[PDB]
Design a protein around this ligand. Structure first.
Ligand SMILES: [Cl-]
Ligand SMILES: [Cl-]
Lengths: 135, 132, 132, 134
């Protein structure tokens, strides 16, 4: 099954990437998220709306479009993630990206400074953009 | 054919009565969100200490696999429900999928129970199954 | 005397207009909770990569030192506002204190604005303070 | 410079709240942060959201229970912020760590993480076996 995926993108990244749309499409199919990402992204945008943002209705549509651009990966075993979480001092959510990223031999793209540090191979969104700009 | 959608709060209460419902597993479903919510919940208890997170997680893993997993909802639609009914995005997800899929949402959350067409709590579900 | 109770969301949008309100500072107040709520918000910024955090936190410290801090609400009363008006405990805190104290809640939360008698947003508070 | 020896956080407040008789005699030694009121409040609220027949009576017992704890002043956002960024703690947790460590108090927490990252911190069982020896 087409496994042209190279990066696992979390919500903090997904959010930043949504801004540089043009820059990364075409390069998608190389980008992936977890099922959890969708909800995290959704909740973030909901918070925006809560604190006032006449958008939301329109912003939600945009997110929906960006989201569909990504490939969604199989959920990790609650089993294994729990371990990473416990061992690396991460939350279950973060330990989820850290676990998939590694077990899948993928580069985790994240904005969270602690995840970048506790995940082998992680890079941030600015790095992803320069990488993609190259090829 | 799936009849109920079980959220994280219910999944938890249900994991305490495995035997009373495994025989009805085909009737229960969850959202991919549920795995994470359930997981993060078990993580907090591990955080607040109690030697067994590994064992406990093993058990949660077992209970989890029993449910069919529905498709993620359109972030679009969920968002409308979240705003229109005063729910979080997560809670909204369940209300949306539950209603939109024509299913009975099983939740322990009084708020979701009140704002979702047909929701019932875990005790209600167990008596329904005991009759089915 | 205090006229408004400002929450974390409002507090943030205010820091950028320090000049426009310090004259009315003793007319403004926050809850003890606010200090922690704002700090955590500033922490997530650092968490998501923000070089300042140290500097930013020092500015946030000064802005906060400008408000009066009211006594903590009775856990008793807040629970009731929270359950009844479907609000988190933290949000209900501001709702309760503002109302029971006869103050104007200044929040950016659309949900809070709608469930707190007489609450206004930061834009409004600013035009009022200007008229003052 | 007070009789306060321990800073009790929310997780602790809860554990303790069911051993009331076993420590109320030492109430003067125990303290909390203003944050604690809200954190404990929010916790109880969650039990209520998830169906807890008596959120009312319960919130009332929690009210009384907490009135016996002295309440220390809020830490300078200043210092907490640094403890957090540095120790991998949230602003909330870092607050206890800072107050406790700074005011030379013994932080009583049920959080394994905070215990680990807070100098001389202990759990409820420890506080209870200690108060007993007093
Ligand atoms: Cl953490
Ligand atoms: Cl809510």
């Amino acid at each position: 099954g087409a496994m042209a995926v190279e990066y696992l993108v979390d919500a903090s990244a997904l959010y930043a990437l949504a801004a540089h749309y043009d820059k990364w499409i075409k390069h998608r199919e190389k980008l992936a998220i977890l099922h959890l990402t969708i909800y995290e992204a959704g909740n973030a945008l909901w918070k925006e709306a809560r604190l006032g943002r006449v958008d939301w209705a329109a912003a939600s549509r945009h997110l929906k479009k960006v989201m569909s651009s990504f490939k969604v990966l199989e959920d990790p075993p609650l089993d294994e993630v729990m371990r990473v979480a416990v061992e690396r001092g991460l939350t279950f959510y973060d330990a989820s990206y850290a676990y998939v990223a590694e077990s899948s031999g993928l580069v985790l793209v994240t904005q969270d400074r602690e995840l970048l540090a506790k995940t082998k191979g992680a890079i941030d969104v600015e790095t992803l953009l320069v990488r993609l700009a190259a090829q």
